[PDB]
Amino acid sequence: MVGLIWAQATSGVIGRGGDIPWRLPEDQAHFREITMGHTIVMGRRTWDSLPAKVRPLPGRRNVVLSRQADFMASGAEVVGSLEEALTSPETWVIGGGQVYALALPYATRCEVTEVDIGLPREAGDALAPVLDETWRGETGEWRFSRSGLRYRLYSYHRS
Ligand SMILES: NC(=O)C1=CN([C@@H]2O[C@H](COP(=O)(O)OP(=O)(O)OC[C@H]3O[C@@H](n4cnc5c(N)ncnc54)[C@H](OP(=O)(O)O)[C@@H]3O)[C@@H](O)[C@H]2O)C=CC1
Ligand SMILES: CN(Cc1cnc2nc(N)nc(N)c2n1)c1ccc(C(=O)N[C@@H](CCC(=O)O)C(=O)O)cc1
């Protein structure tokens, strides 16, 4: 089972200038809840973006995709292809735009956080993959975060 987990603005934007363009700590808690105890797969840029205090993310087997020979990621497994990355039975792909695109075909679950923020797409932005009709979804109720942003969770699946 390969799942993808991401937080996106309603417009599909998930990253800009190498960072996530909003603050929503409740989404980080959700992320932890979903991924804890499992293998997580991320692109090298997503690895770089992790704050040092949680790089690697604790309690999870961190796997980082890179095309670089001896890319160095302490506390993580560096791999050069998706096949070497997606070997675990319960894998969560945690970003970024490139890796979500790459991994979507291997996925059977998506855990999406929609952030109700006006953020029109700009050239060069990292974007969420677009889910077609092979996916069945369940939409959660809107919630307000302490940051003032409304947000909701979506759980998608396909067999
Ligand atoms: N809102 C959210 O939920 C999340 C948002 N993000 C955001 O996403 C952005 C980063 O996304 P993006 O720029 O797309 O980068 P990625 O994190 O997807 O990393 C891309 C890197 O992964 C490696 N890579 C890609 N394809 C392959 C392949 N086929 N084989 C081997 N290595 C491969 C390369 O590493 P190399 O260059 O080393 O070869 C490439 O540069 C940031 O802005 C981040 O904040 C990230 C996670 C979650
Ligand atoms: C930059 N980044 C990538 C990140 C952020 N939010 C996401 N949110 C979702 N829904 N999905 C992702 N893949 C995702 N990835 C980060 C930054 C911090 C932590 C982080 O501190 N996390 C702690 C928990 C912290 C909290 O519980 O507020 C964890 O143990 O998972 C996670 C990912």
Side-chain angles (χ1 to χ4, degrees), residues 17-30:
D19 308 313
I20 293 171
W22 60 77
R23 181 191 129 68
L24 172 47
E26 295 91 342
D27 170 64
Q28 282 189 5
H30 171 66

Side-chain angles (χ1 to χ4, degrees), residues 5-8 13-22 27 42-47 49 65-68 71 79-82 94-100 102 124 126-127:
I5 179 170
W6 75 84
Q8 64 168 89
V13 175
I14 66 165
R16 182 169 297 161
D19 308 313
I20 293 171
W22 60 77
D27 170 64
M42 72 198 84
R44 187 268 307 163
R45 290 183 179 153
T46 291
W47 170 259
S49 78
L65 259 298
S66 187
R67 284 200 190 81
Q68 302 170 52
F71 168 68
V79 294
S81 67
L82 239 221
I94 69 150
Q98 284 175 226
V99 175
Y100 285 139
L102 217 66
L127 303 175

Side-chain angles (χ1 to χ4, degrees), residues 55-75:
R55 194 174 67 239
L57 282 159
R60 280 145 292 190
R61 183 182 182 190
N62 291 49
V63 177
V64 178
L65 259 298
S66 187
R67 284 200 190 81
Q68 302 170 52
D70 173 26
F71 168 68
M72 278 171 271
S74 59

Side-chain angles (χ1 to χ4, degrees), residues 79-94:
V79 294
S81 67
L82 239 221
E83 40 137 356
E84 300 160 63
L86 307 180
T87 59
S88 298
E90 245 244 16
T91 307
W92 283 97
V93 172
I94 69 150

Side-chain angles (χ1 to χ4, degrees), residues 5 10 18 34 36 43 45 57 59 64 95 104 109 131 133-134 139 144 148 152:
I5 179 170
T10 298
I34 295 289
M36 185 66 59
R45 290 183 179 153
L57 282 159
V64 178
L104 215 202
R109 285 186 60 187
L131 302 185
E133 299 308 316
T134 57
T139 307
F144 262 106
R152 58 166 168 204

